Protein backbone atom coordinates (compact mmCIF):
# COMPACT_ATOMS: atom_id res chain seq x y z
CA UNK A 1 0.00 0.00 0.00
CA UNK A 2 2.93 2.44 -0.98
CA UNK A 3 4.57 2.94 2.47
CA UNK A 4 8.29 3.27 3.27
CA UNK A 5 9.24 0.46 5.63
CA UNK A 6 11.12 1.55 8.76
CA UNK A 7 12.81 -0.28 11.59
CA UNK A 8 12.86 0.97 15.14
CA UNK A 9 14.10 -0.32 18.46
CA UNK A 10 11.88 -1.14 21.35
CA UNK A 11 12.85 1.37 23.98
CA UNK A 12 14.74 3.73 21.72
CA UNK A 13 13.52 6.79 19.90
CA UNK A 14 13.12 7.05 16.13
CA UNK A 15 12.79 9.78 13.52
CA UNK A 16 10.43 9.91 10.59
CA UNK A 17 11.88 12.41 8.09
CA UNK A 18 10.71 13.77 4.80
CA UNK A 19 13.73 14.77 2.70
CA UNK A 20 11.31 15.41 -0.15
CA UNK A 21 10.41 18.49 1.94
CA UNK A 22 11.93 21.89 2.67
CA UNK A 23 9.92 24.23 4.92
CA UNK A 24 8.84 27.79 4.09
CA UNK A 25 6.31 30.63 4.48
CA UNK A 26 3.54 29.31 2.24
CA UNK A 27 2.96 26.32 4.58
CA UNK A 28 -0.27 26.47 6.63
CA UNK A 29 -0.61 22.98 8.16
CA UNK A 30 1.58 19.87 8.67
CA UNK A 31 -0.38 16.91 9.98
CA UNK A 32 0.94 13.62 11.30
CA UNK A 33 -1.59 10.93 11.79
CA UNK A 34 -1.55 7.30 13.06
CA UNK A 35 -3.57 4.99 10.71
CA UNK A 36 -5.00 2.20 12.85
CA UNK A 37 -6.42 4.54 15.51
CA UNK A 38 -7.21 7.27 12.97
CA UNK A 39 -5.87 10.02 15.17
CA UNK A 40 -3.59 12.97 14.68
CA UNK A 41 -0.61 12.48 16.92
CA UNK A 42 0.88 15.87 16.12
CA UNK A 43 0.11 18.91 13.98
CA UNK A 44 1.71 22.18 13.05
CA UNK A 45 -1.29 24.42 12.52
CA UNK A 46 0.82 27.50 11.91
CA UNK A 47 1.79 29.59 14.95
CA UNK A 48 -1.94 29.27 15.74
CA UNK A 49 -0.72 26.34 17.92
CA UNK A 50 1.64 23.32 18.13
CA UNK A 51 -0.58 20.32 18.98
CA UNK A 52 0.94 17.02 20.25
CA UNK A 53 -1.02 14.04 21.60
CA UNK A 54 1.66 13.34 24.17
CA UNK A 55 5.20 13.95 25.41
CA UNK A 56 5.97 10.75 23.52
CA UNK A 57 5.69 12.91 20.45
CA UNK A 58 7.69 15.78 19.10
CA UNK A 59 7.38 17.54 15.75
CA UNK A 60 10.06 19.76 14.32
CA UNK A 61 10.00 22.85 12.13
CA UNK A 62 11.42 20.62 9.40
CA UNK A 63 8.43 18.26 9.54
CA UNK A 64 10.27 15.42 11.25
CA UNK A 65 8.35 13.48 13.88
CA UNK A 66 10.25 11.84 16.70
CA UNK A 67 8.65 9.05 18.65
CA UNK A 68 10.20 8.52 22.03
CA UNK A 69 10.77 5.23 23.74
CA UNK A 70 9.21 2.80 21.25
CA UNK A 71 6.63 0.33 22.64
CA UNK A 72 4.77 -2.65 21.04
CA UNK A 73 1.78 -0.31 20.46
CA UNK A 74 3.75 1.97 18.11
CA UNK A 75 4.11 -0.50 15.23
CA UNK A 76 1.74 1.12 12.76
CA UNK A 77 1.46 2.92 9.47
CA UNK A 78 2.00 6.72 9.90
CA UNK A 79 1.06 9.45 7.41
CA UNK A 80 2.14 13.02 6.94
CA UNK A 81 -0.01 15.36 4.94
CA UNK A 82 1.11 18.89 4.46
CA UNK A 83 -0.69 21.90 2.96
CA UNK A 84 0.08 25.52 1.90
CA UNK A 85 -2.07 28.58 2.71
CA UNK A 86 -4.00 28.32 -0.56
CA UNK A 87 -5.30 24.95 0.76
CA UNK A 88 -3.16 22.70 -1.49
CA UNK A 89 -1.69 19.36 -0.46
CA UNK A 90 1.99 19.81 -1.03
CA UNK A 91 3.17 16.40 0.14
CA UNK A 92 2.00 13.13 1.57
CA UNK A 93 4.47 10.54 2.78
CA UNK A 94 3.61 7.30 4.54
CA UNK A 95 5.78 5.18 6.82
CA UNK A 96 5.35 1.53 7.81
CA UNK A 97 7.03 1.27 11.22
CA UNK A 98 7.91 -2.18 12.54
CA UNK A 99 9.89 -2.62 15.76
CA UNK A 100 12.33 -5.15 17.20
CA UNK A 101 13.99 -5.72 20.50
CA UNK A 102 17.69 -4.85 20.45
CA UNK A 103 19.74 -7.99 20.84
CA UNK A 104 21.73 -8.64 24.04
CA UNK A 105 25.42 -9.69 24.29
CA UNK A 106 25.42 -13.42 23.55
CA UNK A 107 26.31 -15.81 26.40
CA UNK A 108 28.76 -18.63 25.86
CA UNK A 109 28.75 -21.58 28.23
CA UNK A 110 30.78 -24.82 28.20
CA UNK A 111 31.99 -27.92 30.08
CA UNK A 112 35.40 -29.37 29.40
CA UNK A 113 34.26 -32.65 30.99
CA UNK A 114 31.51 -33.02 28.43
CA UNK A 115 33.00 -31.70 25.37
CA UNK A 116 30.23 -29.21 24.80
CA UNK A 117 29.86 -25.47 24.12
CA UNK A 118 26.68 -23.37 23.87
CA UNK A 119 25.92 -19.84 22.61
CA UNK A 120 22.59 -18.21 23.35
CA UNK A 121 21.08 -14.69 23.28
CA UNK A 122 18.42 -13.88 25.82
CA UNK A 123 17.03 -10.69 24.31
CA UNK A 124 16.30 -9.82 20.72
CA UNK A 125 13.56 -10.30 18.12
CA UNK A 126 14.19 -12.90 15.40
CA UNK A 127 17.93 -12.96 15.96
CA UNK A 128 20.58 -14.65 13.92
CA UNK A 129 23.58 -16.34 15.62
CA UNK A 130 27.04 -17.21 14.19
CA UNK A 131 29.77 -19.24 16.00
CA UNK A 132 33.46 -18.83 15.12
CA UNK A 133 36.56 -20.61 16.44
CA UNK A 134 39.78 -18.61 16.31
CA UNK A 135 38.12 -16.71 13.49
CA UNK A 136 36.56 -19.54 11.47
CA UNK A 137 32.81 -19.98 10.87
CA UNK A 138 31.18 -22.92 12.69
CA UNK A 139 27.43 -22.69 12.48
CA UNK A 140 24.74 -20.20 11.72
CA UNK A 141 21.44 -20.68 13.51
CA UNK A 142 18.32 -18.88 14.77
CA UNK A 143 17.99 -20.90 17.92
CA UNK A 144 20.73 -21.82 20.48
CA UNK A 145 24.02 -23.13 19.05
CA UNK A 146 25.76 -26.20 20.42
CA UNK A 147 29.26 -27.33 19.65
CA UNK A 148 30.95 -30.54 20.74
CA UNK A 149 34.63 -31.53 20.34
CA UNK A 150 36.72 -34.42 21.45
CA UNK A 151 40.34 -33.43 21.82
CA UNK A 152 41.89 -31.38 24.54
CA UNK A 153 41.05 -27.77 23.55
CA UNK A 154 42.57 -24.28 23.69
CA UNK A 155 40.56 -22.11 21.29
CA UNK A 156 39.13 -18.61 21.10
CA UNK A 157 35.38 -18.76 20.35
CA UNK A 158 33.34 -15.81 19.04
CA UNK A 159 29.54 -15.68 18.96
CA UNK A 160 27.62 -12.89 17.17
CA UNK A 161 23.96 -12.05 17.37
CA UNK A 162 22.10 -9.57 15.27
CA UNK A 163 18.80 -8.42 13.84
CA UNK A 164 17.52 -5.38 11.93
CA UNK A 165 18.28 -2.90 14.68
CA UNK A 166 21.33 -4.12 16.54
CA UNK A 167 24.41 -6.26 16.67
CA UNK A 168 26.17 -7.56 19.76
CA UNK A 169 29.22 -9.82 20.14
CA UNK A 170 31.17 -11.94 22.63
CA UNK A 171 34.59 -13.70 22.57
CA UNK A 172 35.72 -16.24 25.17
CA UNK A 173 39.09 -18.07 25.34
CA UNK A 174 38.47 -21.72 26.02
CA UNK A 175 41.00 -24.13 27.50
CA UNK A 176 40.25 -27.75 28.23
CA UNK A 177 43.33 -29.79 29.21
CA UNK A 178 40.84 -32.63 29.81
CA UNK A 179 42.81 -35.03 32.05
C1 LIG B 1 15.16 17.65 10.87
O1 LIG B 1 15.66 18.26 12.06
C2 LIG B 1 16.07 17.28 13.04
C3 LIG B 1 16.56 18.05 14.24
O2 LIG B 1 15.71 19.15 14.52
C4 LIG B 1 17.13 16.34 12.48
O3 LIG B 1 17.36 15.31 13.42
C5 LIG B 1 16.66 15.71 11.17
O4 LIG B 1 17.71 14.93 10.60
C6 LIG B 1 16.24 16.82 10.21
N1 LIG B 1 15.77 16.24 8.97
C7 LIG B 1 15.84 16.95 7.85
C8 LIG B 1 15.32 16.27 6.57
O5 LIG B 1 16.27 18.11 7.84
C1 LIG C 1 16.80 -7.85 28.32
O1 LIG C 1 15.57 -7.17 28.02
C2 LIG C 1 14.91 -6.65 29.20
C3 LIG C 1 13.69 -5.85 28.71
O2 LIG C 1 13.02 -6.52 27.65
C4 LIG C 1 15.85 -5.76 30.03
O3 LIG C 1 15.23 -5.46 31.27
C5 LIG C 1 17.22 -6.42 30.26
O4 LIG C 1 18.11 -5.50 30.88
C6 LIG C 1 17.79 -6.86 28.92
N1 LIG C 1 19.13 -7.45 29.04
C7 LIG C 1 20.15 -7.04 28.28
C8 LIG C 1 21.49 -7.73 28.51
O5 LIG C 1 20.06 -6.14 27.42
C1 LIG D 1 29.55 -35.95 30.71
O1 LIG D 1 30.46 -37.06 30.65
C2 LIG D 1 30.21 -38.03 31.68
C3 LIG D 1 31.34 -39.05 31.64
O2 LIG D 1 32.60 -38.47 31.96
C4 LIG D 1 28.83 -38.66 31.45
O3 LIG D 1 28.58 -39.63 32.46
C5 LIG D 1 27.73 -37.59 31.46
O4 LIG D 1 26.50 -38.16 31.00
C6 LIG D 1 28.08 -36.40 30.56
N1 LIG D 1 27.21 -35.28 30.89
C7 LIG D 1 26.03 -35.11 30.30
C8 LIG D 1 25.23 -33.89 30.74
O5 LIG D 1 25.60 -35.89 29.45
NA1 LIG E 1 2.93 6.04 18.06
Curated annotation (Swiss-Prot):
Expressed in natural killer cells (at protein level). Changing residue 43 to K: Loss of CD58 binding. Changing residue 84 to H: Loss of CD58 and CD59 binding. The keyword Nucleus does not apply. GO terms for cellular component: cell surface; cell-cell junction; cytoplasmic side of plasma membrane; external side of plasma membrane; extracellular region; Golgi apparatus; nucleoplasm; plasma membrane. Residues 79-93 are annotated as: CD58 binding region 2. Keywords: Cell adhesion, Cell membrane, Disulfide bond, Glycoprotein, Immunoglobulin domain, Membrane, Repeat, Signal, Transmembrane, Transmembrane helix. Disulfide bonds join 112-176, 119-159. Glycans are attached at residues 62, 114, 123. Residues 34-48 are annotated as: CD58 binding region 1. It is found in: Cell membrane. Residues 1-179 are extracellular. One of its GO terms (biological process) is regulation of T cell differentiation. It is a single-pass type I membrane protein. Its main location: membrane. Residues 1-101 form the Ig-like V-type domain. Residues 102-179 form the Ig-like C2-type domain. One of its GO terms (molecular function) is signaling receptor activity. CD2 interacts with lymphocyte function-associated antigen CD58 (LFA-3) and CD48/BCM1 to mediate adhesion between T-cells and other cell types. CD2 is implicated in the triggering of T-cells, the cytoplasmic domain is implicated in the signaling function. Interacts with CD48. Interacts with CD58 (LFA-3). Interacts with CD2AP. Interacts with PSTPIP1. Interacts with FCGR3A; this interaction modulates NK cell activation and cytotoxicity. This is T-cell surface antigen CD2. It comes from Homo sapiens. The gene is CD2.
Amino acid sequence: TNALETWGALGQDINLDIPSFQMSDDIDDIKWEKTSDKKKIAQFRKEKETFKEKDTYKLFKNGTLKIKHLKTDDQDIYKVSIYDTKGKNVLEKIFDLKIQERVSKPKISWTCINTTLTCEVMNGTDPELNLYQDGKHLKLSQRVITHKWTTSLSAKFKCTAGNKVSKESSVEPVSCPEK
